[PDB]
Design a protein around this ligand. Sequence first.
Ligand code: HEM
Ligand SMILES: O=C(O)c1ccc(CO)cc1
Ligand SMILES: [Cl-]
Ligand SMILES: [Mg+2]
Ligand SMILES: [Mg+2]
Length: 393
Amino acid sequence: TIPHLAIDPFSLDFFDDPYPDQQTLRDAGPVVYLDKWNVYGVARYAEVHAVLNDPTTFCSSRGVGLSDFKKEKPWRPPSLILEADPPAHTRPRAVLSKVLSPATMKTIRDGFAAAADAKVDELLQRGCIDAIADLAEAYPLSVFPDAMGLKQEGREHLLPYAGLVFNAFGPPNELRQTAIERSAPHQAYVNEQCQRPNLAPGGFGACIHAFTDTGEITPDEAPLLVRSLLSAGLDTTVNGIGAAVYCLARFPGELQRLRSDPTLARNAFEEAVRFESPVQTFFRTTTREVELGGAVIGEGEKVLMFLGSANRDPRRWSDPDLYDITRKTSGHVGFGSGVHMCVGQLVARLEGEVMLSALARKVAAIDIDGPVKRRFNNTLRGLESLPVKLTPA
Ligand code: HEM
Ligand SMILES: O=C(O)c1ccc(CO)cc1
Ligand SMILES: [Cl-]
Ligand SMILES: [Mg+2]
Ligand SMILES: [Mg+2]
């Protein structure tokens, strides 16, 4: 009843161009079995959304990578938020919600916007830049470590550690083995910065530790929640901003609409998150036998959710393969959905908005003008190098 496919969604050829295989995965049926890795897969919007919103059957506490924590040791101590189910999830989630709250965004908006404006003006003095190293990476590196309250020393471990985290959700392929092998120096840096004396007062890390007084988290939970922000909150925004710039470079008509109304910046970023889905995939593990798409999935089975595919499913989206900055984007699953829906989404959108606002006001054209190179990661989709010429407004 369930179709068996040989597609390896963690292969380099799949990462290089996933869209034909994602359609095969959708059109084969609402649920497929991937023989390469012995997992179920769901790639249509409706089933992806339903699984994300059914946490009592499709759980996260057995790992949201391929590895099942009931069968294997996690490569690092489990996350108290990503790799937890309610009720254990709830109070750590509330702490991160409060630390990254609407109210908190007021405290960082002026500096985040000023740094985006300054970066775009700086790049306009050069003309021809690499939108990854010089923009998608440079801008988050200039604001987010500081907003965390990190010291200066050791920051060169932040992107390597995040790449490791995201590669480690994948299957035990070469990308995962290479990431985990000799990763101890990256882990040691991050783990040390999670300790309270290393985090500047007022920054996100120190604010997490300040919640240990309230009873929401104990002091020994706070370093792992700082660890969550250092895992999830940098590389994602690099690939999100890079996706938006790549979208604007390829769709000049949409750059021109953005220039004409910079208040479209927030939805232009949201649409880039849908269109490229920088976080491509996550797993769940079934806690019980469960019918999904007419297939009976046993207990203890891994289920791979294709977020990027759900975000391009023609059953749900009109012209899914077009970048449309006035699209009604609500419902896309690029930040997830349900109890684990990205708790950093306001920070991600703040960064993306203010960068796209600066481009909208200051740039007239974005032209690719050198070799484009893709970056490969078991979970993240994005580019290694994106040479563009920026023309001033
Ligand atoms: C464009 C940028 C981002 C994207 C595309 C993204 C994507 C996602 C997704 C898909 C999930 C759901 C995981 C799941 O259901 O298993 C999630 C969760 C999470 N994200 Fe983000 N994220 C981004 C930015 C950020 C930022 C800036 C932060 C922190 C500053 C952050 C911190 C987290 C955390 C801690 C979780 C776990 C929430 C929970 O399990 O309740 N993310 N993210
Ligand atoms: O809690 C974490 O360490 C963590 C890591 C990765 C994600 C990816 O969205 C979310 C949370
Ligand atoms: Cl670690
Ligand atoms: Mg260890
Ligand atoms: Mg010290």
